[PDB]
């Protein structure tokens, strides 16, 4: 059975905790501490005890509750409402295959609903499952469901999703969470647990375009130039032509050649796979043409470069900078094997680290603990990819004065 990770999103009070609880309760996957507490067993009491565990400091990320369906192992890896929510998503400590977006039937789509959807697209979460919750509070009415569904469809289509399920539920009474409802004959689609069972396996790194961040470069007498690095995505074959960026951009000519040979642990290979630490001999490339922090790809889909005349947009969490960060801040960005100075050109939004809600557009400054959406200009060219496309090259750290200031993920690149 494939393993799959999910996150719950949606506006505060719309019923994320209650839906998780209902999933746990109806599958009998009650947390052990709660089973012990018990040693009457109604749903309401269990919700009280899940809430109490939360207040004792057990957060969903830490609890990482799991259940089984006929075709999946499912881990609930995170949800808004706890100190390190945004940090876990940005760093990649929590990686989700799917997001369950909970929208209350009583309120509809709210501004924070839309914000979490954007956070989901940004992270590269390809699979959305919408629940329209609290159906019991609107008399199980189809028209209400249909009116909220249309709001949801409009939002998620604008974002680029398509053919996600929209399931009317009552986390509180149980309808369509695990057990098919008998109150909504007008709905014929999956239950939430059925929709979870059908989350597709994640795209494999081998199927993404080739990226190999270069760690070091050798020039061996009578063999030639041998870069060393890790295959992050795609696959490398003897015979392949590879191009190096930002080498090619900096030199205004293609720094590229044919792979004469590959080696891992000083033993020959005919092909290298994701995770392999390799040396490779490239013909027609001079030792001086490439260096640590270059990245190799096929000429087909060369590694994306942000030039000094470009900018990129990132979401960050500020880890350690107690004084104000303002426009013009110029620390050092570390990503894969590169390090380059970067300038903060704009701070577009301040973001709530607990929830991923926007706190403020165009704030003047940010500090330790803030999350933010920022536009950065590299002072030397750098290979970066949007995390939603090639996550292995979409995360970075910001360093200044010996310490780690922030961690970030790349949202987009602005060609200048």
């Amino acid at each position: 059975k494939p393993h799959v990770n999910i996150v719950f999103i949606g506006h505060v009070d719309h019923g994320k905790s209650t839906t998780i609880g209902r999933l746990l309760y109806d599958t009998g996957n009650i947390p052990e501490t709660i089973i012990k507490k018990f040693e009457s067993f109604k749903f309401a009491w269990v919700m009280d005890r899940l809430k109490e565990e939360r207040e004792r400091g057990i957060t969903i990320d830490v609890a990482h509750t799991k259940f089984e369906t006929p075709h999946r192992y499912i881990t609930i890896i995170d949800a808004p409402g706890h100190r390190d929510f945004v940090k876990n998503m940005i760093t990649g400590a929590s990686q989700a295959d799917a997001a369950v977006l909970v929208v209350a039937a009583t309120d509809g789509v709210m501004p924070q609903t839309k914000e979490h959807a954007f956070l989901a697209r940004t992270l590269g979460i390809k699979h959305i499952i919408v629940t329209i919750n609290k159906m019991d509070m609107v008399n199980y009415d189809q028209k209400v469901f249909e009116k909220v569904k249309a709001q949801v469809e409009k939002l998620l289509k604008t974002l680029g999703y398509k053919d996600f399920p929209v399931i009317p539920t009552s986390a509180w009474n149980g309808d369509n969470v695990v057990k098919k409802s008998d109150k909504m004959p007008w709905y014929n689609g999956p239950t939430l647990i059925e929709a979870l069972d059908q989350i597709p396996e994640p795209e494999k790194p081998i199927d993404k375009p080739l990226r190999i961040p270069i760690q070091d470069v050798y020039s061996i007498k009578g063999v030639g130039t041998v870069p060393v690095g890790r295959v992050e995505t795609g696959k490398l074959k003897v015979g392949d032509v590879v191009i190096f960026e930002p080498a090619s951009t900096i030199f205004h000519k293609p720094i590229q050649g044919e792979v004469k040979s590959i080696e891992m642990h000083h033993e020959p290979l005919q092909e290298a796979l994701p995770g392999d630490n390799i040396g490779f001999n490239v013909r027609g490339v001079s030792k001086n043409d490439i260096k640590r922090g270059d990245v190799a790809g096929h000429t087909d889909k060369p590694p994306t470069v942000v030039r000094t005349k470009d900018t990129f947009k990132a979401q960050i969490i500020v880890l350690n900078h107690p004084t104000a960060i303002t426009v013009g801040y110029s620390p050092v960005l570390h990503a894969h094997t590169a390090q380059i100075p970067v300038r903060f050109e704009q701070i577009l939004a301040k973001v709530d680290p607990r929830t991923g809600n926007i706190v403020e557009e165009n704030p003047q400054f940010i500090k330790t603990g803030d999350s933010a959406i920022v536009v950065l200009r590299p002072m030397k060219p750098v290979v970066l990819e949007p995390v939603k496309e090639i996550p292995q090259l979409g995360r970075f750290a910001i360093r200044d004065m010996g310490m780690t200031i922030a961690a970030g993920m790349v949202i987009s690149i602005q060609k200048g």
Binding site: F118, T122, T158, I358, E361
Partner: peptide, 26 residues
């Protein structure tokens, strides 16, 4: 019917907000 105009205005405002989000995350 002032109420209808106000609902539309508020609806459009929310669409403008969506567009601000598209720009922010674009």
């Amino acid at each position: 019917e002032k109420k209808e105009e106000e609902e539309k205005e508020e609806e459009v405002s929310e669409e403008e907000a969506l567009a601000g989000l598209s720009a922010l995350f674009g």
